[PDB]
């Protein structure tokens, strides 16, 4: 009775539809993101329903130094990806400088929570992991209930608790480690979530004097060999 519509607060003081949208995030595949003094690396699992199916794209570009990973409903993620891309390019057209990530994440969070007020609309059933280098590496989590948070390290999706435990164990080493060491730590966390075939793992990097770039297949194979 208290979860039939999204505008009704529960007697405890909870919005059940928004919490169901936040529960839809857990069904997505695992994604992990970590950073250091310089770089950010984001890794994820490309869903493959059958051997005839190609893997599903997991990471997307937003700007020259911004990229995203998603967990939840893919259409919502596509809508928000288009919104962020148009916002970044509109800032680049109106003014001749890069958009602030803080303003962009605030805009995306406002766009989320605008749908949680009108009874006609529904909350966004997708959680976002925005990785960027504006003046320094940065990772942002955005949840369906309108909130966003900075993160030193981050992970979420199906079976993400083990990777989060690995990050809780190894957070103190990421700041001083080199870029290849950081890539190995991210890949080890992604393995701990679970087999890391060339097809089923997406990985990308962004940092100082390094635009957003998916690591190639040969380099990815070399790094996956180095994981042991």
């Amino acid at each position: 009775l208290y979860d039939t519509d999204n505008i009704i607060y529960s007697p405890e003081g909870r919005l059940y539809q928004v919490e169901y949208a936040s529960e839809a995030i857990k069904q997505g595949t695992c994604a992990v993101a970590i950073k250091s003094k310089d770089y950010v690396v984001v890794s994820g699992l490309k869903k493959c329903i059958s051997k005839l199916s190609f893997p599903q794209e997991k990471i997307f570009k937003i700007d020259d130094y911004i990229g995203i990973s998603m967990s939840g409903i893919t259409s919502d993620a596509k809508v928000l990806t288009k919104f962020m891309q148009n916002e970044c390019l509109s800032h680049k057209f109106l003014y001749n400088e890069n958009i602030n990530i803080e303003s962009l994440v605030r805009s995306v969070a406002d766009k989320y929570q605008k749908n949680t007020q009108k009874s006609s609309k529904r909350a966004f059933g997708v959680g976002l992991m925005i990785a960027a280098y504006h003046n320094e590496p940065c990772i942002f989590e955005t949840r369906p209930n309108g909130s966003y948070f900075e993160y030193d390290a981050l992970s979420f999706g199906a079976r993400s608790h083990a990777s989060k435990t690995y990050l809780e164990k190894n957070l103190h080493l990421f700041e001083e480690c080199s870029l290849e060491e950081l890539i190995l730590h991210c890949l080890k966390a992604l393995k701990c979530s679970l087999e890391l075939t060339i097809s089923n793992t997406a990985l990308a990097v962004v940092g100082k004097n390094h635009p957003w770039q998916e690591i190639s297949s040969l380099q990815l194979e070399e790094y996956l060999s180095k994981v042991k």
């Binding site: 607060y9 969070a109 989320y112 929570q113 009874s119 209930n145 909130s147 900075e150 030193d152 957070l171």
Partner: protein, 225 residues
């Protein structure tokens, strides 16, 4: 079955959605504002996210400012609070559009309280889940502190606490009169009441040392307190 809509009075004459919003806000993080002789000291305790160790240290700040001399803090949901804060900023900007002067604090309080109240009328809008402390300090007028409840009310205080554990914090801060105490001598007592660690707290004030303008405590003043 009268509590399933904000636009219906129960047989007792009560709107239960407002009471449920009150319960939700009381379940959220604690926020204090206090009126000292040289300034007002405001702070927030983000202890609900103590379990989350992955958060970047001192990044989730519930303290915001308007026109560089009006602190505005909240207890409730983040998105609704950001709507209220952006509306307050827009109203201040409109007042400067028309009149070339900063908006008075109480007119902003009335306008934003009416804006919050406007959502508690229709059957197709979610009422705001946030209690808002808006405050300022002046050399002449001393500290004006206003608390806007989710029901559209707005009340002036000489000290206010909202969020979880508000009763204990209220009776603790009520013990001593702060109209003859400075902010530097008050931060120690605020930390003592927060104990009854330091990366889950936010602070701000508008005293003379900040030239009566918004600021946050530097780590070198945080630590010795």
């Amino acid at each position: 079955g009268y509590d399933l809509s904000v636009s219906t009075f129960s047989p007792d004459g009560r709107l239960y959605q407002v009471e449920y919003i009150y319960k939700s806000i009381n379940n959220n993080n604690t926020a204090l504002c206090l009126e000292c002789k040289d300034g007002i000291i405001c702070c927030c305790i983000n202890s609900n996210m103590d379990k989350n160790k992955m958060i970047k240290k001192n990044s989730y700040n519930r303290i915001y400012h308007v026109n560089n001399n009006i602190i505005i803090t909240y207890s409730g949901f983040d998105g609704d609070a950001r709507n209220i804060i952006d509306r307050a900023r827009s109203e201040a900007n409109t007042y400067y559009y028309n009149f070339h002067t900063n908006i008075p604090l109480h007119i902003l309080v009335n306008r934003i309280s009416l804006y919050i109240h406007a959502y508690t009328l229709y059957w197709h809008m979610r009422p705001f889940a946030a209690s808002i402390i808006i405050s300022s300090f002046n050399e002449k007028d001393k500290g004006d502190i206003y608390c806007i409840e989710p029901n559209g009310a707005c009340y002036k205080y000489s000290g206010i606490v909202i969020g979880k554990n508000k009763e204990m914090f209220k009776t603790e801060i009520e013990k001593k009169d702060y109209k003859d105490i400075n902010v530097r001598d008050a931060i120690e007592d605020i930390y003592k009441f927060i104990l009854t660690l330091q990366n889950l707290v936010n602070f701000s004030w508008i005293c003379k040392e900040s030239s009566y303008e918004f600021q946050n405590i530097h780590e070198e003043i945080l630590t010795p307190a």
